[PDB]
Amino acid sequence: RFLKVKNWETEVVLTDTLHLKSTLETGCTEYICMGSIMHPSDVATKDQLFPLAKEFIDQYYSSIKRFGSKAHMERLEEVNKEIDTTSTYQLKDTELIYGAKHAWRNASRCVGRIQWSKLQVFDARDCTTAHGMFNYICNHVKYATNKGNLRSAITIFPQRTDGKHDFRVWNSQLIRYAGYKQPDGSTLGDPANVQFTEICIQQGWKPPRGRFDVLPLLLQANGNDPELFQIPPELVLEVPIRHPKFEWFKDLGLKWYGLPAVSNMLLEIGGLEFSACPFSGWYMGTEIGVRDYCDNSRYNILEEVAKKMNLDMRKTSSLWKDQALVEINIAVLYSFQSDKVTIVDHHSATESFIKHMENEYRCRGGCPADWVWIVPPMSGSITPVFHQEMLNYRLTPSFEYQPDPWNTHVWKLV
Amino acid sequence: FLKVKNWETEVVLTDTLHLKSTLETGCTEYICMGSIMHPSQHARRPEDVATKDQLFPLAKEFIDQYYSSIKRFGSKAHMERLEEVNKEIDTTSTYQLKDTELIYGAKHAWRNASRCVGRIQWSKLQVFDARDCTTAHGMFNYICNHVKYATNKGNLRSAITIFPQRTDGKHDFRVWNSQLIRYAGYKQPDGSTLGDPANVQFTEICIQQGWKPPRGRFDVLPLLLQANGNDPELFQIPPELVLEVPIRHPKFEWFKDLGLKWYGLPAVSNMLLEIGGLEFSACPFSGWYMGTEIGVRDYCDNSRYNILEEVAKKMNLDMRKTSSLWKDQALVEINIAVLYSFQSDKVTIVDHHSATESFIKHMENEYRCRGGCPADWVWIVPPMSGSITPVFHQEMLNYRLTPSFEYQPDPWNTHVWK
Numbered sequence: 001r002f003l004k005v006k007n008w009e010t011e012v013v014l015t016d017t018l019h020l021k022s023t024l025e026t027g028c029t030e031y032i033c034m035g036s037i038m039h040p041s042d043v044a045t046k047d048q049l050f051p052l053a054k055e056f057i058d059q060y061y062s063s064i065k066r067f068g069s070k071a072h073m074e075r076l077e078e079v080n081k082e083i084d085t086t087s088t089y090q091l092k093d094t095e096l097i098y099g100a101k102h103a104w105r106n107a108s109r110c111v112g113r114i115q116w117s118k119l120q121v122f123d124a125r126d127c128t129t130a131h132g133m134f135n136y137i138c139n140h141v142k143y144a145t146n147k148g149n150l151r152s153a154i155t156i157f158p159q160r161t162d163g164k165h166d167f168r169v170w171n172s173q174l175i176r177y178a179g180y181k182q183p184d185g186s187t188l189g190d191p192a193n194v195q196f197t198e199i200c201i202q203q204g205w206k207p208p209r210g211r212f213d214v215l216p217l218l219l220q221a222n223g224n225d226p227e228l229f230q231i232p233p234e235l236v237l238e239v240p241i242r243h244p245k246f247e248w249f250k251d252l253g254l255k256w257y258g259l260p261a262v263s264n265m266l267l268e269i270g271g272l273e274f275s276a277c278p279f280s281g282w283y284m285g286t287e288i289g290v291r292d293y294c295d296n297s298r299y300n301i302l303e304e305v306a307k308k309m310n311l312d313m314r315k316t317s318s319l320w321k322d323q324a325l326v327e328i329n330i331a332v333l334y335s336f337q338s339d340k341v342t343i344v345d346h347h348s349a350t351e352s353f354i355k356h357m358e359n360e361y362r363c364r365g366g367c368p369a370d371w372v373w374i375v376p377p378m379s380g381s382i383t384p385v386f387h388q389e390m391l392n393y394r395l396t397p398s399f400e401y402q403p404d405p406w407n408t409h410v411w412k413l414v
Numbered sequence: 415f416l417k418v419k420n421w422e423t424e425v426v427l428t429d430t431l432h433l434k435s436t437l438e439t440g441c442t443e444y445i446c447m448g449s450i451m452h453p454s455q456h457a458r459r460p461e462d463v464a465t466k467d468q469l470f471p472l473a474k475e476f477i478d479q480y481y482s483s484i485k486r487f488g489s490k491a492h493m494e495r496l497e498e499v500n501k502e503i504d505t506t507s508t509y510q511l512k513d514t515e516l517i518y519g520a521k522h523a524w525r526n527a528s529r530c531v532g533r534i535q536w537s538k539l540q541v542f543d544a545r546d547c548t549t550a551h552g553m554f555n556y557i558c559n560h561v562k563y564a565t566n567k568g569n570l571r572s573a574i575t576i577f578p579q580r581t582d583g584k585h586d587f588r589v590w591n592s593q594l595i596r597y598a599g600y601k602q603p604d605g606s607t608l609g610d611p612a613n614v615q616f617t618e619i620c621i622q623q624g625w626k627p628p629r630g631r632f633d634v635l636p637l638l639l640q641a642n643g644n645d646p647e648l649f650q651i652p653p654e655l656v657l658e659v660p661i662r663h664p665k666f667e668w669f670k671d672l673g674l675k676w677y678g679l680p681a682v683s684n685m686l687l688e689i690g691g692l693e694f695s696a697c698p699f700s701g702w703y704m705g706t707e708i709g710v711r712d713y714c715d716n717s718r719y720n721i722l723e724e725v726a727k728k729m730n731l732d733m734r735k736t737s738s739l740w741k742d743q744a745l746v747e748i749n750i751a752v753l754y755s756f757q758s759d760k761v762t763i764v765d766h767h768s769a770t771e772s773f774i775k776h777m778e779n780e781y782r783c784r785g786g787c788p789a790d791w792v793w794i795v796p797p798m799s800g801s802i803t804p805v806f807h808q809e810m811l812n813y814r815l816t817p818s819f820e821y822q823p824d825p826w827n828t829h830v831w832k
């Protein structure tokens with residue numbers, strides 16, 4: 001069986017066979033589509049783990065043209081022994097690297113996957129304490145940031161065991177700014193991070209109470225209570241936002257960090273769950289310029305920018321929001337490029353994603369892609385992905401959502 | 415029950431309407447086809463003249479639904495109607511809708527149209543019953559009346575004109591035009607395209623049918639009308655019925671020199687209206703534009719008028735690299751101009767901010783009174799400035815309710831000429 005996808009701009013038609021390998025649920029049913037649901041839908045038993053492990057080891061050995069080899073069969077034998085005797089197993093380093101890369105390759109929501117195979121994998125499975133996690137994360141940040149020449153990287157902490165000894169980065173990203181609810185209902189800093197900022201403060205963090213306070217790391221090792229650590233400031237590369245034409249833009253006092261590093265997802269490889277697996281790449285500008293800066297729930301700067309632009313804001317059909325949004329995103333890109341910090345604009349990124357998609361169809365038989373996420377949050381139809389039909393399905397290894405740690409963690413101190 | 419969350423407002427709506435869905439979406443629990451243009455070929459009755467046990471269940475379902483809608487389920491009139499539809503099918507292999515049922519069905523096909531952001535207006539739909547029509551000339555008359563009513567000197571009014579339903583499939587009524595009013599497209603000797611590239615093929619059919627093209631950039635195409643399965647016939651819409659808006663910019667006096675215009679009346683005419691198993695293959699319907707339809711898609715798609723280059727040049731933007739966002743900057747100015755121009759000419763238009771806000775309001779109304787609102791996020795989110803409209807942050811459930819508007823093959827792919 002085959003499924004065809006068409007680009008309505010180029011009329012290129014691609015043929016997806018890879019969807020036949022999909023495993024887990026999309027959330028849709030035959031009569032309901034949940035493609036715009038953000039999160040649709042304790043630890044694996046021995047019986048559940050065997051086939052998951054087998055399928056992963058089979059696909060690892062197929063990828064390296066060793067399917068059915070003696071090494072393939074001995075690895076299956078060996079994996080089965082550990083599951084039988086220990087109720088889990090340990091990945092070889094090669095398998096960990098392959099697994100991490102393919103979870104990225106399989107991330108249907110990620111427009112940046114043309115880069116999937118160039119992923120630096122830091123094996124942190126020997127880590128035992130939050131201090132060790134901090135050290136591993138600093139090394140990750142420093143390597144990934146690379147003085148602005150950003151390099152993709154992931155750091156993989158020990159896998160889940162009984163679900164009671166989870167490693168977790170409590171931060172949603174490694175680098176984010178604090179948010180502080182004011183008594184008057186206004187928010188200082190990033191409103192998205194108010195709750196997490198409260199948790200940090202409650203754990204002892206002394207907040208500067210500024211607009212762009214880099215949050216401390218809140219790191220949980222082995223199911224213990226999480227611990228606070230300040231990322232050394234010299235490792236946090238930031239970009240002050242200015243505009244190439246509007247001299248007043250710098251007066252807005254905006255900055256952002258260079259390193260987008262997601263740390264609250266779960267990496268699943270062969271049925272193993274890596275609950276702490278921070279990964280980082282580089283920014284597409286609309287992430288900052290459209291969502292971080294202009295979401296009504298985020299820094300919400302449209303009004304201020306439009307004011308300084310002298311736009312007519314009395315009516316929506318003046319498209320004053322649209323006009324200000326473009327300029328903000330111009331500023332974001334100009335600023336990063338001026339500081340020689342890796343960034344990709346949505347046009348280049350979606351263009352590369354189409355090339356990647358077509359290549360994946362050619363060499364892999366498909367490429368799961370979540371149109372709702374792949375299309376940029378501005379100027380959608382002038383990017384090529386808008387016109388690209390996509391099939392969404394869940395391949396493993398995969399990155400998955402997991403509950404926030406403060407909702408499941410049971411505290412131990414006092 | 416299924417919940418949808420708005421991630422900006424944290425409003426959660428609980429959907430039960432989806433339990434009434436009838437057609438496959440194309441998705442499965444293993445694959446999502448949400449961005450496929452035509453994901454499913456699941457039809458409620460086979461392609462041509464259904465047997466009785468194929469059509470009657472669909473008719474019963476619709477009549478049941480109609481009589482439920484007016485609090486008359488099981489009433490004398492309801493049961494008589496069932497008996498009547500049963501006899502009609504028994505004796506003609508089809509049945510005929512009452513005017514009230516026709517109107518109910520058309521409004522509900524609109525209400526059920528998951529891709530339409532304009533549905534807050536759904537019950538304000540003028541329905542023109544053209545089921546007595548027999549010739550392309552009569553179809554032209556009906557369409558002219560529709561266009562004139564709908565246009566209303568720029569105070570646009572939503573309307574649908576419904577021609578005779580399909581019978582055996584060899585006697586189809588079709589408007590071969592994809593929309594009642596579109597501009598021609600011409601292949602130039604050098605290889606470029608003049609006018610609307612989407613309509614090059616249709617334009618060639620027209621020319622081949624005897625149409626004399628003026629070969630300009632905005633030549634309103636003739637109507638190509640097919641009645642009772644016969645060869646289609648060309649008709650020129652009276653130009654006084656075709657309201658057009660010259661596009662100018664409130665700030666850039668040079669914008670008018672681009673010579674752009676668009677027509678006021680968006681009037682889709684290639685879709686199929688399905689009510690109770692009956693298929694109305696010619697059912698042109700029209701409302702009024704959301705500005706982005708013109709300013710983003712019509713004007714700025716690469717395979718349409720593709721005007722970003724021209725506009726950015728006149729704006730003196732740096733077009734060397736994508737990261738100057740010169741396309742995005744021109745895109746906004748174009749859409750400012752379109753809205754400004756329609757508004758200056760007192761032609762109904764809605765901007766994507768107002769339209770998307772109305773749709774969120776419509777969603778809430780529908781969840782409150784109806785228990786759900788099928789909505790296709792991929793189509794509802796405007797093609798520019800997505801996340802600064804509320805619908806971007808609105809989770810949606812997409813499912814297929816009947817009555818409905820369906821796609822159908824282009825008639826030139828299926829018509830055996832005479």
Ligand code: HEM
Pocket residue numbers: 100104107109110111112113115119152153154279280281282283284287344349373399
């Ligand atoms: C190298 C440059 C990269 C670029 C330009 C890029 C771009 C993006 C963008 C724009 C998004 C949407 C983010 C949002 O809207 O919140 C995204 C999502 C995502 N990225 Fe990539 N990314 C990159 C690297 C990576 C890497 C290295 C990984 C993992 C190894 C990764 C995994 C993911 C995942 C799992 C998502 C979806 C998150 C979710 O579902 O909530 N990306 N990416």
Ligand code: HEM
Pocket residue numbers: 520523524527529530531532533535539572573574699700701702703704707764769793819
């Ligand atoms: C009255 C004002 C209306 C507005 C502002 C409006 C807006 C829109 C827009 C922007 C689209 C997407 C168009 C595209 O991207 O090609 C759309 C699609 C659609 N509209 Fe509406 N519309 C209106 C009236 C109507 C009416 C009166 C009907 C039917 C009686 C209708 C039925 C549909 C359908 C079926 C689609 C989906 C078309 C497809 O799947 O290809 N709309 N509408």
Ligand SMILES: CNCCc1cc(F)c(F)c(-c2cc(C)cc(N)n2)c1
Pocket residue numbers: 112173260261262264265279280281282283284287
């Ligand atoms: C759990 N859902 C988080 C989604 C998210 C939020 C965010 F703020 C990001 F920055 C990225 C993201 C991640 C990577 C690796 C590259 C990139 N460009 N963006 C992804």
Ligand SMILES: CNCCc1cc(F)c(F)c(-c2cc(C)cc(N)n2)c1
Pocket residue numbers: 532593680681682684685699700701702703704707
């Ligand atoms: C078959 N798919 C065609 C989709 C389509 C194309 C188009 F060009 C339009 F103009 C509208 C449309 C229709 C109505 C009633 C109002 C409105 N604003 N737009 C819809």
Ligand SMILES: C[C@H](O)[C@H](O)[C@H]1CNc2nc(N)[nH]c(=O)c2N1
Pocket residue numbers: 035036037038372373374421806807808809810
């Ligand atoms: C409701 C909707 O699914 C939600 O707002 C999505 C839309 N598309 C997105 N796309 C990206 N890249 N990131 C997002 O956070 C979202 N949010």
Ligand SMILES: C[C@H](O)[C@H](O)[C@H]1CNc2nc(N)[nH]c(=O)c2N1
Pocket residue numbers: 008386387388389390448449450451792793794
């Ligand atoms: C492939 C993709 O589904 C296709 O480009 C869709 C995307 N969303 C759309 N949304 C609207 N309103 N109109 C369209 O034509 C499209 N095209």
Ligand SMILES: [Zn+2]
Pocket residue numbers: 028032033034035441442445446447448
């Ligand atoms: Zn789906």
